[PDB]
Amino acid sequence: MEAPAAAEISGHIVRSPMVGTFYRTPSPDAKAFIEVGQKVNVGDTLCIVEAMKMMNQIEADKSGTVKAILVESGQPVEFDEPLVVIE
């Protein structure tokens, strides 16, 4: 009879599968892919990442709720590098 109780999910952590950059919005005066305090389901965008001289969107790989954004909009990322933390 706790947070988990059953099913169990355990927060996740988006690890830039490709070195480059990371973004949270398609623009400066644009909406945010993930609004802190929202839920995401497998198939919902979590953020973006710059690589291969082109934008690379990141779709949630496991439905969950925001947790904390380590990387910032535009901040560079590396391999096995943590980006966003989901719950």
Swiss-Prot record:
Per the entry, what this protein does is: This protein is a component of the acetyl coenzyme A carboxylase complex; first, biotin carboxylase catalyzes the carboxylation of the carrier protein and then the transcarboxylase transfers the carboxyl group to form malonyl-CoA.
Indicate whether Repeat appears among the record's keywords. Answer: no
Specify the pathway.
Lipid metabolism; fatty acid biosynthesis
Tell me where on the tree of life, at the top rank, the source sits. Answer: Bacteria
Range of the intact protein held here:
70 to 156 of 156
Where does the record place the Biotinyl-binding domain?
4-87
Q: Which residues carry this modification: N6-biotinyllysine?
A: 53
Q: Which GO terms describe its cellular component?
A: acetyl-CoA carboxylase complex; cytoplasm; cytosol
Q: Which UniProt keywords apply?
A: Biotin, Fatty acid biosynthesis, Fatty acid metabolism, Lipid biosynthesis, Lipid metabolism
Q: What binding partners and quaternary form does the record give?
A: Homodimer.
- Name any Gene Ontology BP term: fatty acid biosynthetic process
- The protein in question is named Biotin carboxyl carrier protein of acetyl-CoA carboxylase
An annotated Gene Ontology molecular function: acetyl-CoA carboxylase activity
Reply yes or no: does the keyword Lipid biosynthesis apply.
yes
Q: What is the lineage of its organism?
A: Bacteria, Pseudomonadati, Pseudomonadota, Gammaproteobacteria, Enterobacterales
